[PDB]
């Protein structure tokens, strides 16, 4: 609709639909972000979203999660090469390892779990204020099968951390990633399961 020709505007519409559209349909959008990245005038963010659109359905697609990881990883590498936010792409990389882990959630812990953990450490180091970095940490710790010495107990500060960050998350310029906001919020309930009565005020 209209010539547009603006990198930010093209992404603004795509990102807005991205939240609304089912994760299965990310395949359509991944291609578009990739198309944007191929053309000049694009930024690392286009690569970020391209990988994102592959990684999210990867969790629900163990059939070729590893193969789609290859595409996502290459795009992520481009983001890293350009000099974009390391933490944001680190978060995507940890998820990719996690998605591959789901194929065999009994033996993949040693390698893929480690990959996710390694990337998360990178995410926290790169951007210590990153909500997604804490979110993934809380999620990983919550669902830790005692392998990493985790548990909801260790996910307690991480779940609250990510949520606390979203509270101040103004979001800029506009097409900045909104994903994980709702997930972190519900994750906290899962992480604490405090269920403390607080109706009276």
The tokens of 38 are what?
């191929």
Q: Which residues contact 12 (CB under 8 A, 6 or more apart)?
A: 174, 175
- CA gap 94, 89 in Å, rounded: 9
Environment class of 178 (CB within 10 Å of its CB; exposed 0-12, middle 13-18, buried 19+) = middle
- CA gap 146, 156 in Å, rounded: 15
Environment class of 79 (CB within 10 Å of its CB; exposed 0-12, middle 13-18, buried 19+) = buried
Domain carrying residue 90? 1-201
Distance of CA 116 to the CA centre of its chain: 12
What experiment produced this structure? NMR
Q: How many domains does the chain have?
A: 1
- CA gap 21, 62 in Å, rounded: 21
Q: Is the separation of the CB atoms in 38 and 69 below 8 Å?
A: no
Count of Cβ atoms closer than 10 Å to residue 32 Cβ: 18
- CA gap 180, 133 in Å, rounded: 10
- CA gap 98, 114 in Å, rounded: 9
- CA gap 73, 67 in Å, rounded: 10
The tokens of 39 are what?
């053309």
- CA gap 83, 170 in Å, rounded: 23
H-helix or E-strand containing 26?
helix 26-38
């Amino acid at each position: 609709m209209g010539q547009g020709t603006a990198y930010a505007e093209v992404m603004n519409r795509k990102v807005a639909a991205l939240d609304s559209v089912p994760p299965t349909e990310y395949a359509t959008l991944a291609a578009d972000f990739s198309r944007i990245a191929a053309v000049e005038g694009s930024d690392w963010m286009a690569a970020y979203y391209t990988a994102y659109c592959r990684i999210i359905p990867a969790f629900g697609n163990p059939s070729e999660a590893d193969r789609l990881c290859e595409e996502a990883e290459s795009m992520l590498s481009k983001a890293e090469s350009l000099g974009g936010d390391l933490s944001e792409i680190a978060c995507l990389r940890s998820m990719a390892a996690s998605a591959r882990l789901l194929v065999n959630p009994q033996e993949r812990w040693q390698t893929y779990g480690a990959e996710s953990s390694r990337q998360l450490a990178v995410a926290l180091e790169a951007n210590p204020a990153n909500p997604r970095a804490y979110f993934l940490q809380a999620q990983s710790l919550l669902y830790t099968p005692a392998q990493f010495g985790g548990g909801k107990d260790k996910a307690l500060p991480f779940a609250e951390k990510s949520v606390s960050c979203y509270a101040a998350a103004t979001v800029s310029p506009a097409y900045a990633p909104h994903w994980g906001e709702q997930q972190a919020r519900q994750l906290l309930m899962l992480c604490k399961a405090e269920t403390q009565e607080l109706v009276p005020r």
